[PDB]
């Protein structure tokens, strides 16, 4: 299996270790603080060879935000973030839409083409860098409000599925109508259905043993902030 560990750059030094001893690969988190840092990129690039992929900045971004200075900003750190990506040798870039917590599904669908559309300088820069762009489920209510985004880009823009993320933030737990949207990459923690608390696999209320088997051949990274072999246990006992 592609099983790889979700951190920060900012913690690339713990992290690195505990990926060779477990045999895992990386996604590594894009701290907007160290963009900036040349050597932090060249240093992680060097020492490292299994499968990474990045997660972009996210926090406090929306490229469709009331605010015109927080679009530009949303814009710069996106487009960066793939040329840092592309650096790394990145296989894939995970991105949230920036919608914000609490909008109907109704309000989300609104959103839909005008974010396909703001979305497109982003999908062509990855493009042009080799980099697959993937969308990540935030705070949409509804798998409804991302199929015309992934739908208008025709296969350009993957998508990833975070389960805790539907729990607790969707108006959609279920995780098989996300499921339906084909998610090629898997964001993979427990939750109590409350907090996206980022538990270990097994620990927490999401049931991945109903759902998730189906998808064990696509990239799964596990976005848990504790160590995660009990969560590497936890699939290779459901791999056979
Ligand atoms: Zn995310
Ligand atoms: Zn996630
Ligand atoms: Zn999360």
Redesign the pocket.
């Known amino acids: 299996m592609d099983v790889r560990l979700a951190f920060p750059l900012s913690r690339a030094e713990e992290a690195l270790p505990r990926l060779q001893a477990l045999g895992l690969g990386a996604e590594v988190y894009l701290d907007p603080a160290l963009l900036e840092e040349d050597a932090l990129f060249q240093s992680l690039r060097r020492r490292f060879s299994g499968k990474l992929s990045v997660?972009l900045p996210?926090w406090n971004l929306d490229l469709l935000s009331p605010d015109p200075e927080v679009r530009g900003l949303t814009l710069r750190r996106l487009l960066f973030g793939l040329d840092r990506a592309a650096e790394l040798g990145a296989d894939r870039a995970?991105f949230?839409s920036g919608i914000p917590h609490g909008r109907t599904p109704e309000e989300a669908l609104e959103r839909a083409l005008p974010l396909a559309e703001a979305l497109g300088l982003v999908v062509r820069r990855a493009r042009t860098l080799g980099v697959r762009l993937l969308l990540?489920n935030?705070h949409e209510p509804h798998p409804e409000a991302l199929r015309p985004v992934l739908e208008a880009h025709a296969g350009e823009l993957g998508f990833?599925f975070?389960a805790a993320?539907a729990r607790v933030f969707s108006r959609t737990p279920d995780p098989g109508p996300w499921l339906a949207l084909a998610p090629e990459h898997l964001?993979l923690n427990d939750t109590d259905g409350v907090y996206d608390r980022h538990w270990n696999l097994g620990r927490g209320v999401l049931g991945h043993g109903a759902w998730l088997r189906p998808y064990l051949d696509r990239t799964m990274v596990l976005?848990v902030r504790e160590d995660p072999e009990a969560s590497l246990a936890f699939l290779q006992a459901l791999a056979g």
């Open positions: 997660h996210f995970v949230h990540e935030s990833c975070d993320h964001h976005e």
